[PDB]
Design a protein around this ligand. Structure first.
Ligand code: SF4
Ligand code: SF4
Ligand code: FES
Ligand code: FES
Ligand SMILES: [K+]
Ligand SMILES: [Zn+2]
Lengths: 124, 696, 160, 112, 183, 70
């Protein structure tokens, strides 16, 4: 193939497989940055000639994980406050404005906040 | 006029009517400011520049309060430092805690002034929270995070006054005042991206540069901008091998701390479509070849077709440096050929301005003097595209005085008001002898501006003859203290090519069906004849139509990868500076010509830059004075104006169509810049669309 | 005693002075300096006060993380302290302490910037090792080993 | 001053023959409105036509063989920089800073 | 006053909806400019904006685009004017407009009770629109009727010195068309 | 020594009083990814980690095409 394995996409096309070592991450096939080197090209190198690719570090791609979270919906307020759900062990407190009819993600965490009144259109 | 005053014991002598802050800045006292910029109208709303005047209880906005005589101005009283910390404690009340994720991080004035002039602690633990605003989308070039705006109106004042784009303003009242465009529409100005530099905070940041570097990483290199002929002084920031961003730098004679949106956001074309290895055409495809094999093939190919005396054609592109021009001009004459010209679209074989007299093809009035001009006549020029920054200079004059601008050519949507006259030569003919021509002669320093696109018309010689006929018969247009005739160029290597006479004046030679064509960065040869039985070599840094036609391709270096000489439209000689290395095995542009000569039996005398830089003294002795203009002496200029006047010229009545039909695709780097592709989709070829279809 | 620094003026402790200038005297003085340290250490355990451990000046000391993540000015100062640094007013100094080896001092030259312009380090061992020739003159090879040990030559300081 | 002081500095010969230094005063940055980094004169060396920076194959670092890439000198007078450059026998070239032209600015000008 | 300063095109409002003055409003508009000098005719945006507001019912985007066209101005200088002033309605707004002052000099005469009395009858809160489009309640700052404090304001009328039992007369009548006499 | 699981590596060094099997559920780490068997230090084997550059090259060479004159 090498078509998805070498170009970054917002969402993949086929279901990722944990055993496929050529995937960028065990839970995602294509890379998630335009300048991120594909993992297929990275391991096609002389230094991997006598290695065991299954034991090299393969952390789970964080882009796929963060979009598996539900959208927080705020009730009768257009401003959400996020702090990383840890206070002094999270990110700095940032206020998110939800006037626009979309889910605005937090700058640090990546959690997506919206209004309850906008949920029906958003969930379409 | 000057009023003598003391600021904190330092005597100050400034022009009368100046503000206190300019007086203080001259005495060396530093007065913190957010809303005051030295090229914008004065608003006094940020309230950070407050000082104390001896005969008053009320603190003075030193950016607005005009200077007095004998006045005593205090800046370091404990009363003032209390005020500075109070104001600082107010701006940061609603400011987001965004510094880690904010692209203004290491270069934000709200950080450095708060650190220097504010308190070290914050007293805002309120439970309701801060104010939040929605980010407005105003195009693909400006990334807005309006949470961070400190309501200083530099964006509004610049776009309204300098840029002439009245769609940006303050909508709302009080705590809900929201800088923006009210409705959703993209900002349409060729100078709109200069707002990114003015916005002191992270509210308006570059979209192409977003999240890519921190200001302490970059290495700043002072060079020139070659996307248009003004040669605006820029600053190129490189993080290692890549060029990350381009910014303006102060030069009050050329650009005045602005650069057009083409200049700054075309930096990402340098990483795409680059020529990195020599390529040799085999069959219908290219293969990689070494410099030994590629230089030999050109040497071998030249002797196979055996071009005669003047059957060798050299074509010079828009971006080409001056050192390569002379290296190529010497090389072709070393083979005894003078079929050397450019890839433009000129009609008459001797270009209407010619190359004999410098006064006929430069901007003789100098850009710094356009401020004091009384009347300006535009002939077939669209400065909004050809020289974007120069257009803003004319507007600033037309807003502060009674300058009247006259335009002859194709009508265009201009920033300042025009007095349209017509769209052909005959229209200009009556206008010169009519009411408008009378206006110029009565004026002290009138201006006549001829565009670069005049030549590319069928009536190239008629207009130059017509206008010169007016100039050759006046005393106000050309004085000892004024030279009122100007030509506006748009390709960055015209004045360089004409100063060294890289132009053929023999009509029969220009018609010779040349067999060996050596393309030096020429990428617009669609109309130019290239016979199927011609051996073409292209030496450039980008793969485009010029490289597609070639049979051997020799990679070269961009202006950010070499030291070179450029002469801008007004005759000023400017030398770039090397910021990075050329990619791959790509060599220097004039070094290839020297190395190619040794294979072709025309070994050039030069061995290095300094040896070649001695050659620039030979061709024209003014090409060794950097950033210095050698104005044409008044007497000799009047000789050149006469030879342009020729009885027996027929005006064909061709519309003086502007040559720039796409503002963003003009050079090789622009056509390969991914960001410029977004602009054409969002703004359009003429920056006229008001809605962004491309929005996702 | 000559220039007391950092609470050394608050505690009470004695010093020991030799009389023969030989290795045995320096052995005894060090063993006394052990017991005088154990006398100061107890007092600092009993006289320890409460309060801040650093200057209450966020323009030279990073703000606490909790305040950093909640207060805007703390975030600005935390940002500029870890990237730009803090500026030191121009001038120069020569600060000496009673290091365990001897007198250690630094000659720091400031330029108003965030980086020292000059920093000369006066290591006690470096000045001692020069006097080795003047002392070892007239001694045997087993006696040289004693003189090096009685000088306390850690050569990181000598070869700074 | 007049002496060939470079013969005692032990510097490699290539700084005299093969490298070009530049005496310049740093320009004001467009992004920020401060005017303090533009009051001291500095000397920097030109980059090399090849081998200034190249990508390390293994980890993607920025390798370099230019031993003057991170050397910037500071001065307080222009003459001291030129004198020092002359003393070392450096092949320098001076970059004259641009001078902003004065223009009086008045609050009332928005209507007059 | 509802303080939102970014306009979003609705099915009811967009620049694609035409707006043209009536034959009468041209005569007033032609003579409204008569109060301003020739070189400063742009000062008449505030009259024309409210004059055009009444023809349509509120301050639509088409009005602002039309008003800018009339006086030779970029549409933004009208947007700045429109959203700075609190009497321009950038929404359908319905038929009537209840303005209830809640400032301190009014709040001394139990101005809270008038607010509760209105909210009871119409099943709406301040800043809301009735399901019928006949009414749209709206809080307001001082209107000048402070010496006669407990005052309601409907459209442009006055009803001072009120009580929750004074609200029964008006809220019933306006639906039936029987409008009480203002003053 | 690399065979000791990270949770217990801290307890063994007298760094904590609560063993990682007596942790409060409001003190356990929350992992949104499957956790596999502990992998010891893999040096002197074939599983030793190999560094590589995670960034693409910074210049993209021209994709050559040939066009033929009229
Ligand atoms: S604009 Fe300045 S103060 Fe505000 S978040 Fe960005 S860096 Fe911090
Ligand atoms: S957006 Fe930037 S330039 Fe415009 S007012 Fe706000 S801080 Fe000033
Ligand atoms: S600088 Fe004077 S109030 Fe802003
Ligand atoms: S306080 Fe209510 S009308 Fe004045
Ligand atoms: K900015
Ligand atoms: Zn968050």
């Amino acid at each position: 193939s090498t078509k998805e394995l070498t170009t970054a996409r917002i969402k993949d096309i086929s279901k990722p497989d944990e055993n496929n070592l050529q995937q960028q991450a065990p839970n995602r096939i294509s890379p998630w940055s335009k300048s991120q080197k594909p993992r297929a090209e990275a391991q096609d190198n002389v230094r991997f000639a006598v290695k065991d690719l299954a034991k090299q570090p393969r952390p789970y791609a964080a882009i796929d994980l963060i979009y598996k979270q539900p959208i927080r919906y705020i009730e009768h307020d257009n401003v959400a406050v996020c702090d990383g759900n840890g206070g002094a062990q999270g990110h700095p407190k940032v206020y998110i404005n939800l006037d626009q009819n979309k889910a605005i993600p937090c700058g640090y965490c990546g959690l997506r906040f919206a209004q309850a009144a906008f949920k029906e259109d958003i969930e379409s | 006029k000057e009023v003598e005053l003391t600021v904190d014991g330092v005597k100050v002598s400034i022009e009368a009517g100046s503000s206190i802050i300019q007086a203080a800045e001259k005495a060396g006292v530093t007065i913190p400011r957010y809303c005051y910029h030295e090229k914008l109208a004065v608003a006094g709303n940020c309230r950070m520049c407050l000082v104390e005047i001896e005969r008053s209880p009320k603190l003075a906005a030193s950016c607005a309060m005009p200077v007095q005589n004998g006045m005593s101005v205090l800046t370091n009283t404990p009363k003032i430092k209390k005020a500075r910390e109070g104001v600082t404690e107010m701006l940061l009340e609603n400011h987001p805690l965004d510094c880690p994720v904010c692209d203004q991080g290491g270069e934000c004035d709200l950080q450095e002034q708060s650190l220097r002039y504010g308190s070290d602690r914050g007293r805002f633990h309120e439970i309701v929270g801060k104010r939040a605003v929605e980010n407005k989308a105003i195009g693909p070039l400006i990334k807005t995070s309006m949470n961070r705006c400190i309501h200083c109106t530099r964006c509004v004042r610049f776009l309204n006054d300098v840029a002439g784009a009245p769609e940006f303003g303050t909508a709302g009242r009080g705590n809900d005042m929201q800088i923006g465009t009210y409705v959703e529409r993209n900002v349409n100005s060729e100078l709109s991206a200069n707002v990114i530099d003015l916005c002191p905070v992270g509210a308006l940041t570059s979209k192409p540069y977003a999240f890519r570097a921190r200001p302490w990483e970059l290495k700043r290199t002072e060079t020139i901008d070659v996307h248009d002929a003004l040669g605006s002084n820029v600053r190129v920031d490189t993080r290692g091998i890549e060029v990350m961003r381009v910014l303006p730098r102060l030069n009050d004679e050329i650009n005045e701390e602005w650069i057009s949106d083409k200049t700054r956001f075309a930096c990402d074309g340098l990483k795409t479509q680059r020529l990195t290895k020599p390529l040799i055409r085999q069959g219908n495809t290219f293969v990689d070849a070494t410099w030994e094999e590629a230089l030999a093939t050109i040497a071998e190919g030249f002797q196979k077709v055996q071009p005669k005396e003047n059957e060798i054609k050299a074509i010079v592109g828009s971006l080409t440096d001056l050192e390569s021009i002379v290296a190529l001009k010497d090389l072709v004459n070393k083979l005894g050929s003078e079929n050397v010209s450019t890839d433009g679209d000129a009609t008459t074989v001797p270009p209407a301005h010619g190359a004999d007299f410098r006064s006929n093809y430069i901007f003789n009035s100098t850009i710094d003097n356009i401020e004091e001009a009384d009347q300006i006549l535009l002939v077939g020029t669209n400065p909004r595209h050809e020289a974007a920054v120069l257009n803003a200079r004319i507007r600033k004059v037309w807003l502060r005085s009674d300058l009247e601008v006259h335009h002859v050519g194709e009508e265009f949507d201009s920033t300042f008001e025009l007095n349209h006259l017509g769209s052909d030569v005959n229209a200009l003919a009556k206008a010169l002898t009519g009411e408008v021509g009378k206006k110029l002669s009565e004026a002290s320093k009138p201006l006549i501006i001829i565009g670069s696109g005049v030549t590319e018309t069928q009536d190239a010689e008629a207009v130059y003859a017509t206008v010169a006929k007016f100039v050759t018969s006046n005393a106000n247009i050309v004085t000892p203290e004024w030279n009122g005739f100007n030509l506006l160029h748009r390709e960055a290597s015209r004045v360089g090519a004409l100063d060294v006479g890289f132009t053929t004046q023999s009509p029969e030679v220009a018609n010779t069906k040349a067999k060996f064509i050596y393309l030096l960065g020429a990428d617009e040869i669609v109309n130019k004849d290239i016979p199927k039985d011609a051996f073409v070599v292209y030496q450039g840094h980008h793969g485009d139509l010029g490289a597609s036609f070639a049979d051997v391709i020799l990679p070269g270096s961009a202006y950010t990868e070499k030291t070179a000489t450029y002469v801008n439209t007004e005759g000023r000689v400017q030398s770039t500076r090397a910021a990075t290395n050329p990619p791959g095995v790509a060599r220097e542009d004039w070094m290839i010509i020297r190395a190619l000569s040794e294979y072709l039996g025309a070994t050039l005398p030069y061995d290095n830059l300094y040896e070649m830089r001695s050659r620039l003294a030979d061709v024209a002795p003014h090409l060794l004075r950097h950033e210095v203009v050698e104005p044409v002496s008044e007497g000799i200029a009047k000789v050149g104006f006469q030879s342009l006047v020729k009885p027996g010229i027929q005006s064909k009545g061709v519309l003086l169509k502007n040559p720039i039909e796409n503002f963003y695709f003009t050079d090789v780097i622009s056509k390969s810049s991914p960001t410029m592709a977004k602009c054409v989709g969002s703004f359009g070829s003429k920056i006229e669309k008001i809605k962004d279809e491309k929005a996702n | 005693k000559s220039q007391p620094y950092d609470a050394y003026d608050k505690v009470d402790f004695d010093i020991a002075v030799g009389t023969k200038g030989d290795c045995y005297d320096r052995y005894l003085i060090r063993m006394t300096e052990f017991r005088q340290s154990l006398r100061i250490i107890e007092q600092c355990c009993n006289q320890m006060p409460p309060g801040p451990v650093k200057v209450e000046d966020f323009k030279v000391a990073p703000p606490p993380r909790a305040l950093m993540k909640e207060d805007m000015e703390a975030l600005i100062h935390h940002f500029l302290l870890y990237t730009k640094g803090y500026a030191v007013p121009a001038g120069e100094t020569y600060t000496a302490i009673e290091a365990p080896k001897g007198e250690m001092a630094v000659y720091v030259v400031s330029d108003g910037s965030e980086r020292p312009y000059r920093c000369k380090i006066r290591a006690p061992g470096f000045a001692h090792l020069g006097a080795f020739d003047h002392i070892a003159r007239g001694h045997f090879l087993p006696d040289a080993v004693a003189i090096i040990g009685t000088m306390d030559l850690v050569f990181g300081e000598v070869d700074r | 001053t007049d002496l060939a002081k470079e013969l005692v500095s032990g510097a490699p010969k290539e700084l005299i023959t093969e490298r070009v230094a530049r005496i310049y005063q740093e320009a004001k940055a467009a992004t920020q409105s401060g005017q303090h980094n533009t009051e001291t004169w500095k000397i920097d060396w030109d980059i090399l036509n090849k081998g200034n920076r190249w990508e390390n194959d293994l980890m993607g670092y920025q390798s370099s063989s230019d031993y003057m890439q991170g050397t910037i000198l500071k001065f307080d007078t222009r003459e001291g920089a030129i004198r020092f450059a002359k003393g070392q026998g450096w092949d320098y070239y001076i970059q004259e800073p641009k001078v902003r032209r004065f223009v009086k600015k008045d609050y009332s000008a928005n209507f007059y | 006053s509802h303080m939102i300063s970014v306009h979003r095109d609705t099915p009811k409002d967009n620049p694609e909806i035409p707006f043209e003055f009536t034959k009468e409003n041209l005569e007033r508009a032609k003579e409204i400019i008569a109060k301003y000098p020739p070189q400063y005719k742009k000062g008449a945006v505030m009259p024309l904006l409210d004059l055009g507001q009444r023809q349509l019912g509120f301050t639509s985007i088409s009005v602002m685009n039309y008003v800018a066209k009339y006086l030779d101005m970029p549409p933004m200088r009208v947007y700045e004017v429109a959203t700075f002033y609190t009497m321009y309605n950038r929404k359908p707004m319905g038929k009537y407009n209840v303005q209830v002052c809640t400032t301190t000099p009014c709040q001394l005469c139990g101005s809270d009770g008038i607010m509760k009395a209105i909210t009871e009858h119409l099943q709406i809160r301040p800043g809301q629109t009735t399901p019928d489009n006949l009414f749209t309640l709206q809080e307001v700052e001082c209107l000048g009727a402070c010496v006669n404090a407990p005052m309601i304001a409907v459209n442009d009328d006055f009803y001072e010195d009120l009580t929750p039992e004074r609200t029964v007369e008006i809220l019933k009548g306006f639906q039936s068309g029987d409008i009480p006499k203002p003053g | 020594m690399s065979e000791v699981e990270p949770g217990w590596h801290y307890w063994l060094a007298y760094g904590t009083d609560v063993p990682p099997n007596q942790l409060k559920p409001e003190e356990k780490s929350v992992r949104a990814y499957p956790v596999k068997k502990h992998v010891p230090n893999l040096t002197y084997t074939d599983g030793a980690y190999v560094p590589y550059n995670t960034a693409r090259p910074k210049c993209a060479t021209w994709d050559p095409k040939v066009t033929e004159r009229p």
